Structure 1
């Protein structure tokens, strides 16, 4: 099969009247549908339940954006049966056929981009460009994995020949697994985590984050329309740990693909290591578990450029990114000039209902707000609050862009993932100390350096121990294909998304010799 070379889906900036008009139209359609109910999707059909889940607007939490069905263990077992039944034949599809199915799904998603963006705006409080980046990335994952999967097609393995024999090695999919998706990229990462394993012959049971069940269902409408055979992909929104735990611990779950908090990732990995009664394999678990990401700026940097990149990195989607700059490490000569610019830029950021395209919408839920406010309280004892640090007026979960300075490297706010608009500024003597401070956390996801000194940049290339490192630019928004995404240390298992290597994680190899 021959398609155009992969390119990334353009991220809409809404600079044209037509773009703005199209968004307003999408926002109107989506809100007119706030009354909709979305069932489970199991074995190729929408399956409702007696109990339901409610999805709220974080910019107006008294407003319901939709309701969904609620899976328990029984529906989890039904989905598992459907997934294994589907696997028996889905595994035998030619790779070209599976890749075409994905390409169809990408084309349908592209055609519904505005509707999906507008759903992210209302359901998770993304502003317009954050919303567009999320959906574009989801399209990218489907387009990239469709093509990348062909690189593994029968028989892909390079082997040494032997006289009088055919020696053939080839990959085969694992089976049925469970995807446990995050709320902060509930189209992009939700889609990527499902379609990567599915592209090469696996089948998947997907549990959306509670906060983003509506947009998850809409992605499944796309899967349904694309025509994935029954049981290949399944959708199980649920409350609390019931569904996820049942599947993670199940003897017949073959793999687990997880993105979310370290607390939960650690439990998943530990459970994956155990042989459940009657289990007949070693479970694979892929976890991406967040970061405490730093930007270093030294005295040679373009300070204006640095301040812009820090502000985008720290406060983009309200700092609710595993990639967010939550630490700003400044050498002596960079401290005053950089901090002053960061403060001036940050104090101008607007915060309000996401649909108005503010610089920041609200945090995602009452629980997120509680967590972020609690860390702000901790931060008041550990550093010097110099900007924000409070809830803003309205029922929406609006929190001001927050900055603490003179933060000790080993402070709780300098070590623990806050996942909100809170930046900790750390002052260091020189570049060597900046690297030491950058490295001394349990995590290793993203990092950045602003500097004009080549020796400092190339030193960081070698020694700033993070999976995704960026020089003289923002540290968020890794692009599929361009920047393989995934970390070191307690940021997870280094499963690089948007990379050729990702699909190998969902395959095993068979070696077959015939002696003639």
Structure 2
């Protein structure tokens, strides 16, 4: 009811989907129907693919610096529209407006800006072989890539995916999460408004098992970039391979550990833990959900942790004093509660939370209290499985080598962090943790220069950093022979 019927975006104009069916998107703070959104058919994906192939031809035909200037124009618009877009992100995801105004559009435009200035620097190699022959390589675009986004950081994930694709000369077909489609459509307007060729950034909406699947199966799409669940990511990746042998980037979940060593400043460690567990209402791909505290500091540490949680300002995501909103949708809230119920059932001593917040207007919303369990064993479900909700698990260890072994005893490897004041230990311990994103005495910072990605089953490939731009290009090796040819026939 709140917004006009959202249509598909193909070729710089809005288009009509050829399906006749729609789905709704819902405000989690109250339950509003935000908009009826059209779902794409197999015919609409085929249209976006054809629109992207021809649009990419124009984008790639430009100079490195033209694309650089156009993308930089898109940065300028994103900054001028920060407040407008940040509010729209809060309507759809339920994230505090204090967070979306400073983080989502801010750091999403940050990465677009970083690559925008690196486009002219994309280069190939040159190797001499002998007086008569040398090889040189080219870095050409892949062509049409497609990105599938998650719902916790809709606008940023779109930028973190599309920024390097466009910097490298590709067109991207973006499918926003079925939960949060509004914001990605506004980014398509902005890319077109900045001068990006028609077709280079199309947006397809609809159910994940259908339109997302069809994008991954398509014979002309050259790469799939996916953010989401590890379990879903496997089904996605196997499909992208078996269909046409596409290159893939996977940013999946993780049960990331945070080790607090004895010489750590406990006040800093408690600030770290709560930031790593309860920011965005605990709905971050890289949250440090397994906090390893040394037995000797266990009691003092929970004292500091409960003190922070109790002053967490939960409330309406539209209110500026709110730093803790609802969960993304009523279905997801229920599973987070199921895990919370599972932690109680296996006798993991609750400390706070464990309730759905219902008093006053919070019954109209999908509110879950900041929840911390303690005295957890390694075999409990809340220690083994990714909850993707505001649930901190405090584990107790005895030796340094035990905490590193346990941090590693997970099928996940997205993030890890140590907190310590010793030079030797900080570096020695971070080297032993099997994770791609490692923090020392901090948590949650991802600058655009720093490649971020998962070990093991938390991901394949990387995002951000220099390395990521390279993986949106293909190496072509050209050997130039200047001398005579030796045939054995």
Q: Does 1:506 align with 2:466?
A: no
Match of 1:45 among 13, 20, 28: 13
Q: Does 1:59 align with 2:29?
A: yes
* Shift of residue 255, structure 1, vs aligned partner: 0.9
SS at the partner of 1:211?
coil
In the alignment, what sits opposite 1:305?
268
In the alignment, what sits opposite 1:343?
306
In the alignment, what sits opposite 1:385?
350
Match of 1:221 among 160, 173, 189: 189
In the TM superposition, what whole-angstrom CA distance separates every residue of 1:33-68 from its partner, at most 9, and x where no partner exists?
Answer: 93233321112221023433322211111x233333
In the TM superposition, what whole-angstrom CA distance separates every residue of 1:64-100 from its partner, at most 9, and x where no partner exists?
Answer: 3333322121101111111122233332322212222
Q: Supply the distance in 2 between the matched residues of 1:224 and 1:123 (Cα, whole angstroms).
A: 23
In the TM superposition, what whole-angstrom CA distance separates every residue of 1:476-508 from its partner, at most 9, and x where no partner exists?
Answer: 232222x3211111110131x220100111111
Q: Is the 8 A contact 1:332 1:430 kept in 2?
A: no
**Structure 1 stretch displaced more, 191-200 or 372-381:** 191-200
How many residues end up aligned between the 2 structures?
473
Q: How does 1:237-248 map to 2 (within 5 A)?
A: 237-248=205-216
SS at the partner of 1:216?
helix
Q: Is the 8 A contact 1:352 1:360 kept in 2?
A: yes
* Shift of residue 161, structure 1, vs aligned partner: 5.2
Q: Is the 8 A contact 1:178 1:247 kept in 2?
A: yes
In the alignment, what sits opposite 1:145?
115
State the TM-score, normalized to the length of structure 2: 0.93
Q: Is the 8 A contact 1:181 1:209 kept in 2?
A: yes
Q: Supply the distance in 2 between the matched residues of 1:307 and 1:101 (Cα, whole angstroms).
A: 44
Q: Supply the distance in 1 between the matched residues of 2:376 and 2:120 (Cα, whole angstroms).
A: 49
Q: Supply the distance in 1 between the matched residues of 2:477 and 2:3 (Cα, whole angstroms).
A: 54
Q: Does 1:197 align with 2:131?
A: no
Match of 2:329 among 365, 386, 393: 365
Q: Is the 8 A contact 2:127 2:134 kept in 1?
A: no
CA RMSD of aligned residues (A): 1.7
Q: Is the 8 A contact 1:58 1:396 kept in 2?
A: yes
Q: Is the 8 A contact 1:83 1:233 kept in 2?
A: yes
Q: How does 1:99-114 map to 2 (within 5 A)?
A: 99-114=68-83
Q: Supply the distance in 1 between the matched residues of 2:118 and 2:92 (Cα, whole angstroms).
A: 32
In the alignment, what sits opposite 1:136?
106
In the TM superposition, what whole-angstrom CA distance separates every residue of 1:211-248 from its partner, at most 9, and x where no partner exists?
Answer: 22111111111112112212211000112310011111
SS at the partner of 1:296?
strand
Q: Supply the distance in 1 between the matched residues of 2:75 and 2:116 (Cα, whole angstroms).
A: 9
* Shift of residue 178, structure 1, vs aligned partner: 1.3
Q: 1:70 to 1:332 in 2, by over 3 A?
A: same
Q: How does 1:281-430 map to 2 (within 5 A)?
A: 282-357=245-320, 358-382=322-346, 383-393=348-358, 394-430=363-399
Q: Does 1:432 align with 2:393?
A: no
Q: Is the 8 A contact 1:297 1:334 kept in 2?
A: no
Q: Supply the distance in 2 between the matched residues of 1:68 and 1:273 (Cα, whole angstroms).
A: 30
Q: Is the 8 A contact 1:467 1:494 kept in 2?
A: no
Match of 2:459 among 487, 492, 498: 492
Q: Supply the distance in 1 between the matched residues of 2:405 and 2:272 (Cα, whole angstroms).
A: 22
**Structure 1 stretch displaced more, 90-99 or 289-298:** 90-99
Q: Supply the distance in 1 between the matched residues of 2:479 and 2:396 (Cα, whole angstroms).
A: 62
Q: Is the 8 A contact 1:299 1:332 kept in 2?
A: no
Q: How does 1:54-203 map to 2 (within 5 A)?
A: 54-61=24-31, 63-131=32-100, 132-153=102-123, 156-160=124-128, 162-165=130-133, 167-203=135-171
State the TM-score, normalized to the length of structure 1: 0.88
SS at the partner of 2:99?
helix
Q: Is the 8 A contact 1:98 1:200 kept in 2?
A: no
Q: Supply the distance in 2 between the matched residues of 1:341 and 1:172 (Cα, whole angstroms).
A: 53
Structure 1: stretches of 5+ with no match in the other structure: 1-32
Q: 1:164 to 1:239 in 2, by over 3 A?
A: same
In the alignment, what sits opposite 1:9?
none
Q: Supply the distance in 2 between the matched residues of 1:168 and 1:56 (Cα, whole angstroms).
A: 53
SS at the partner of 2:469?
helix
SS at the partner of 1:60?
coil
In the TM superposition, what whole-angstrom CA distance separates every residue of 1:270-306 from its partner, at most 9, and x where no partner exists?
Answer: 11221x3xx5xx3101111111012111221111111
* Shift of residue 106, structure 1, vs aligned partner: 0.8
